[PDB]
Structure formats: structure tokens, C-alpha cells
Design a protein around this ligand. Structure first.
Ligand SMILES: CC1=C(/C=C/C(C)=C/C=C/C(C)=C\CO)C(C)(C)CCC1
Ligand code: NA
Length: 134
């Protein structure tokens, strides 16, 4: 497939407020969150991945095996638990987060030297794009 390993800096963040609102994140947390420009630090070995969303407020750590369902604790975000599976879809990663909210998930992929992340919940789409510092 592809190796996502890298320290990726955020260039684009569209519709993040609407995504967090769909997760019932409170006004307070949303206001601060929208100002953050979280980086993604990814380390990967084959089907094992650690994806760290890094900000000056809180970090969120995902540590999983592609293809293998796990209990995802979304502490710090909406503090929900999901039954989550990240799967290969050709060269993209597709994440389905089963739980309270319908259609909750995300898609991660590389186009050239850009890392694209699309986050989804209840028909709301947030678009993020990242690049490494060369
Ligand atoms: C709201 C909120 C945050 C949301 C982080 C999210 C939503 C990360 C999603 C990552 C995905 C979907 C794939 C790679 O792990 C963080 C915790 C930065 C700071 C506290 C506020
Ligand atoms: Na908006």
C-alpha cells in the first residue's frame, strides 16, 4: 500500500465547526478547537499505525492494526466510545466508527506530497489537508 509515516502540518481545515457541532461538542470547546491547527504525526509499520493528532490543547492518539476492529475511546473529543475499524480501500484508509452517531468515520489518503483527511458524521463533511515541511 503506502507508508503514511511523517510529521504532517495542517494547511486546510474546512467545516471543522460543523463536524464538532454534529458531535455535540460544546460552544466553548468548539471555539478554541477551531483556532487550533492540529498536526498529524504518523508512524507506521505495515498494517500497524499510530496516528497522533497534536495540538497545544489536547492530543488524540489512535493506535491500531488495519483491518482489526477495536474499541475506540474518543476521550477529549466527544468522550464517546466507538467500535472502530480502519480498512484499506486500495491505497486509502477508510475508518468506520460504529456507535451513537450515524455515518461516523473518515478517509485518509495521499495525493502527491499532500495528506488528505475527510472526516464525516451525520452527513457533515470536514476536509483537512496536510503537508510535511521540506
Ligand atoms: C475537538 C478537538 C480535537 C479533535 C481531534 C480530532 C477530531 C482528530 C481526528 C483524527 C482522525 C479522524 C484521524 C487521525 O487520527 C483535538 C482533540 C485536536 C483537540 C481538542 C478538540
Ligand atoms: Na462553517
Amino acid at each position: 500500500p503506502v507508508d503514511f509515516t511523517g510529521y504532517w502540518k495542517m494547511l486546510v481545515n474546512e467545516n471543522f465547526e460543523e463536524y464538532l457541532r454534529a458531535l455535540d461538542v460544546n460552544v466553548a470547546l468548539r471555539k478554541i478547537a477551531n483556532l487550533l491547527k492540529p498536526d498529524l504525526e504518523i508512524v507506521q509499520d505495515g498494517d500497524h499505525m499510530i496516528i497522533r493528532t497534536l495540538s497545544t490543547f489536547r492530543n488524540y492518539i489512535m493506535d491500531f492494526q488495519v483491518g482489526k476492529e477495536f474499541e475506540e475511546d474518543l476521550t477529549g473529543i466527544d468522550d464517546r466510545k466507538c467500535m472502530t475499524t480502519v480498512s484499506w480501500d486500495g491505497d486509502k484508509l477508510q475508518c468506520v466508527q460504529k456507535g451513537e452517531k450515524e455515518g461516523r468515520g473518515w478517509t485518509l489518503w495521499i495525493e502527491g506530497d499532500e495528506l488528505h483527511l475527510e472526516m464525516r458524521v451525520e452527513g457533515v463533511v470536514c476536509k483537512q489537508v496536510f503537508k510535511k515541511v521540506q
